[model samples]
Target: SRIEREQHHLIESIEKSTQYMAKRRIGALISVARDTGMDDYIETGIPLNAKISSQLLINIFIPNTPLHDGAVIIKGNEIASAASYLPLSDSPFLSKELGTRHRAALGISEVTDSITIVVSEETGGISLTKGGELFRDVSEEELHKILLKELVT
Candidate 1:
């Protein structure tokens, strides 16, 4: 059960950090890479190569910080980088209310097998993207279930 424990820890860290940001209405984009490598699909930003933790995620997303404006890519148990640029979805059907972060999340999902989480600054709502589909305004319970299903093989 070691792998399960580790995965659980990762998920918990992500969930806690996301909830903290959401409560404060902080905008955040987190791309969690799965089966596919992300180097070819995204503009990998400042490489941190640091261990992931709830506090780390919180700090990176603090408003007006250098890294707060772009996406954070997570590879395995580490934060690959921050301030990364993700392709934006040009789908006309996308809601007009959706911002760049949401579009980028959907765009990455469309191209690669990655799960992206977005915490809105406008609404403070949590959203998830996978396979080009966006699950908007998901509850904390829903986030946990989705992460377990997608992040843990």
Candidate 2:
């Protein structure tokens, strides 16, 4: 998280430019997809722990916050439903640079109805999370082109 290590630098880089986080995440995810050759989204039997944790947190926090106007009751299993309503929670990661990744990705998909992908720098594994659910079938080319369009356009 060299970017976060120098928080001043990231803020300065994004001083006036909005969508900076999304811009940065698109590039990083595209790079990860290109480098790992894990272009096709696969559905492993194992659930992604990182995302599960993230979903759980947002599910609990939003329903309980002023954001929801406290009008709804969110059960544990209903986290996904809550998330689709809430924009993606900011990306949570050890690296500060990537902290914005989830939020940006979530934001992008919520606005455009397009999918968002994030790669784990530590694991080099690709994750396609959008609107609160993980994607199981996506082509690598589709990923690249979609990413390109989502970011550039």
Best-performing candidate as measured by lDDT: 1
lDDT of 1 at 25: 94
TM-score of 1: 0.95
Model 1 Cα lDDT, one tens digit per residue, 1-153: 466776788899889999999999999999999889897534569888878899999999999888787999998777888999899998887898989999999999999999999999999999999999999999999999999999886
Residues 1-153, model 2: lDDT tens digits: 342333333222222121222323222221111112221221211122222232233332232343222111111112122122223344443235443444545444443444445443333334454544444224455545444443332
Indicate the residue-level lDDT of 72 in model 2.
15
Stretches off by above 4 angstroms in model 2 are 1-27, 30-98, 134-153
TM-score for each model: 0.95, 0.26
lDDT of 2: 0.31
